[PDB]
């Protein structure tokens, strides 16, 4: 009956920064995933655990769509068993992942001529993220022994770093909007 609000997820004007990735629970609706896979706007479309064409057949309790913006080179990190800044301190997928990872270039939307600084990623953390955990704290990261009294300094770094997105950057440094469907049963 009701159609799944996938238009509001893939086609939204604004995408959250990766460190504060936005999750939108989707339920009580019917969607066609086959046309999603055969679309031409999606440069990257990986499905783990379930084949793309069988999605519309199987029934799932809930579907979560996490959306964010990362660099082009960091798209490989959105996958089970990966390491790096994104897969450790910003967005971590479980090893037993059951879902699809969709990404497409959004250089025209998410770049600025002088550099777009509205997209940030966590750069340090006291420990690796557990799967599907969001950390939006902006407390100063203490990399040494002396306590950082909320002030940047020696061995005291601000964890959030902003992507410098410009339309002239190479492909590996252009923003990519990523949507990660996660099927839970």
């Amino acid at each position, epitope marked *: 009956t009701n159609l799944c609000p996938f*238009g*509001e997820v893939f086609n939204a004007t604004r995408f959250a920064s990766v460190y504060a990735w936005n999750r939108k629970r989707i339920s009580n609706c019917v969607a066609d995933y086959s046309v999603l896979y055969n679309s031409a706007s999606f440069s990257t479309f990986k499905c783990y655990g379930v084949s793309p064409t069988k999605l519309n057949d199987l029934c799932f309790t809930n579907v979560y769509a996490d959306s964010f913006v990362i660099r082009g080179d960091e798209v490989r990190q959105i996958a089970p068993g990966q390491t790096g800044k994104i897969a450790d301190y910003n967005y971590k997928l479980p090893d037993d992942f059951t879902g699809c990872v969709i990404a497409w270039n959004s250089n*025209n*939307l998410d*770049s600025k*001529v*002088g550099g777009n600084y509205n997209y940030r990623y966590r750069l340090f953390r006291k420990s690796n993220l557990k799967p599907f955990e969001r950390d939006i704290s902006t407390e100063i990261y203490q990399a040494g022994s002396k306590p950082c009294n909320g002030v940047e300094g020696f061995n005291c770094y601000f964890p959030l770093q902003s992507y410098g997105f410009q*339309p002239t950057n190479g492909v590996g440094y252009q923003p990519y909007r990523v949507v990660v469907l996660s099927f839970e049963l």
Partner: antibody
Amino acid sequence: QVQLVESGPGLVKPSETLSLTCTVSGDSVTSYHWSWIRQPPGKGLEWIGYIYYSGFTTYNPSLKSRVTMSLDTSKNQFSLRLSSVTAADTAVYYCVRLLSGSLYWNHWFDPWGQGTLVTVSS
Amino acid sequence: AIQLTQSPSTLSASVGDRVTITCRASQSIDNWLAWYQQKPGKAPKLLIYDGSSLQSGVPSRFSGSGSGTEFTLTISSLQPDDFATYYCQQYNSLFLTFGGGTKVEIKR
């Protein structure tokens, strides 16, 4: 509050380049999307094209081969350049800010500039 | 690609009357529609966006109501400041198009 002022020649010979420039005051030119709307005298409004702050432009299909828009961040202004003008290109040209809606193609125009008049005569 | 036709082209109504302007689209445009007020010799002024949302600063007598292919703009109590031309713009494509335009006038 963003304020927009048009500028450019008011008299343009036929088969020439219509060069217009919209100066943005109150904010940076790269903080918003911008568009150009023209209105022939005593007729309805028409949309020319819009330019995102990333420099990527979308043009009216009927004018896609003659319209060129660009950003001049140094002067905090964006420009429109229309080539091969004819007697049908005389109008009032408004430069507007392009507000963005829920989906990425949803746009409406506010606030509008005062609007300059351009006449194509010989 | 998407044509907007407004009806009636010209409407005459006295102050305090209820005025209804209809904008009709050739293809479904969801709630993606805006209304502009154009007084003669001045720049258009945004009134309503997303079908029914009301722009900040606009008097409350302006009301927008409609979805799909038919929309309406209603002025509860017509006032001397409400005699102008009203355009409906659709933004459900990469080709933004306006309407023909409806002119309202002091009925006498």
